[PDB]
């Protein structure tokens, strides 16, 4: 709306959570489907939602059930690519046309998130996500545990990195979950997103909450 538009327009960087915000799905749950272990993994993903558990361990546990091969990830991207949330294409377009720097931050995986960023004309340099490792033959080999997104609080750590690198004056974090809400601070403002699933505790506690990306499209262009 009005005050929301003024806040939105003041941003010089916008960071989007990926799973359930930029896309309708959860990258890791979709990889779990492609790999045949969806039920177990999707419960663990629920267990981990919010600031609920040590992220690095929950990620290891889930990846150990999945054991994604390079070709499986490759197949996910080619045959079962995630669905962009309605309106995100247009929103990112309006942001970029205003020279707002857009980032994607995800506890999911660079291979999938870079695919999503490409669809949004977000450079890979603006993607922060976990990196799967693979052995020479493609077998799952683990993940890069040095990534900020591999730890609890990783979204806030990414935003701190961006502030230190680029000195943005006003970074807004946009996402569906408590972990996104918990990235402000260091983000300057947080907008909760409930277009795919409403996380009531975010909706109840966020100063700004939208259920439809059009709501930020506060003009006619």
The residue among 17 and 188 lying less far from Ca ion, judged by its C-beta, is: 17
Task: Please report whether residue 17 would count as binding Ca ion according to CB under 5 A.
Answer: yes
Cβ distance 130 to 137 under 8 Å? no
| Among residues 19, 25, 29, 215, the one that binds Ca ion under rule CB under 5 A | 19
39 labelled as ligand-binding?
no
18 labelled as ligand-binding?
yes
Token code pair at residue 98: 């205003």
| Among residues 29, 176, 188, 215, the one that binds Ca ion under rule CB under 5 A | 176
| Among residues 108, 177, 194, 195, the one that binds Ca ion under rule CB under 5 A | 177
β-strands 13-17, 208-210 pairing? unpaired
Residue 22, helix vs strand vs coil? coil
Task: Please report whether residue 85 would count as binding Ca ion according to CB under 5 A.
Answer: no
16-24, 91-99, 145-153, 187-195 -> range binding Ca ion (CB under 5 A)? 16-24
Cα dihedral 130/22/80/64 (nearest 10)? 30
Q: Can you say whether the dihedral through the CA atoms of 63, 67, 68, 70 is positive or negative?
A: positive
Whether 17 is a known active-site residue: answer yes
Say if residue 77 is exposed, middle or buried (CB neighbours under 10 Å; 0-12, 13-18, 19+): middle
195 labelled as ligand-binding?
no
Among candidates 195, 188, 196, which has minimal Cα distance to 210? 195
Task: Please report whether residue 45 would count as binding Ca ion according to CB under 5 A.
Answer: no
179 labelled as ligand-binding?
yes
Whether 39 is a known active-site residue: answer no
19-27, 39-47, 60-68, 183-191 -> range binding Ca ion (CB under 5 A)? 19-27
Among candidates 173, 195, 200, 37, which has minimal Cα distance to 106? 173
Among candidates 205, 169, 203, which has minimal Cα distance to 187? 169
4-12, 13-21, 32-40, 136-144 -> range binding Ca ion (CB under 5 A)? 13-21
Among candidates 60, 36, 38, 37, which has minimal Cα distance to 48? 60
Residue 82, helix vs strand vs coil? coil
The residue among 100 and 183 lying less far from Ca ion, judged by its C-beta, is: 183
106 labelled as ligand-binding?
yes
The residue among 69 and 130 lying less far from Ca ion, judged by its C-beta, is: 130
108 labelled as ligand-binding?
yes
Annotated binding site for phosphate: 50, 179
Annotated binding site for O-phospho-L-serine: 49, 106-108, 155, 179
Residues annotated catalytic, as ranges:
17, 19
Catalog residues that contact Ca ion under the rule CB under 5 A.
Answer: 17, 19-20, 176-177
């Amino acid at each position: 709306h009005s005050e929301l538009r003024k806040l939105f327009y003041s941003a010089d960087a916008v960071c989007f959570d990926v799973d359930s915000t930029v896309i309708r799905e959860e990258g890791i749950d979709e990889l779990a489907k492609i790999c045949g272990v969806e039920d177990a993994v999707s419960e663990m993903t629920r267990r981990a939602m919010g600031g609920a558990v040590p992220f690095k361990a929950a990620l290891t546990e889930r990846l150990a059930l999945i054991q994604p091969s390079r070709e499986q990830v490759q197949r996910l991207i080619a045959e079962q690519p995630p669905h962009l949330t309605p309106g995100i294409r247009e929103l990112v377009s309006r942001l970029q046309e205003r020279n707002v720097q857009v980032f994607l931050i995800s506890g999911g995986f660079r291979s999938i998130v870079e695919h999503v960023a490409s669809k949004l004309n977000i450079p890979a340099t603006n993607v922060f996500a976990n990196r799967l490792k693979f052995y020479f033959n493609g077998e799952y080999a683990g993940f890069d545990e040095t990534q900020p997104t591999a730890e609890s609080g990783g979204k806030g750590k990414v935003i701190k990195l961006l502030k230190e690198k680029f000195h943005f004056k006003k970074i807004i974090m946009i996402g569906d979950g408590a972990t996104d809400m918990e990235a402000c601070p260091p983000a300057d403002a947080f907008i909760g997103f409930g277009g795919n699933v409403i996380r009531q505790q975010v909706k109840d506690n966020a100063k700004w909450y939208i259920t439809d990306f059009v709501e930020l499209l506060g003009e006619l262009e």
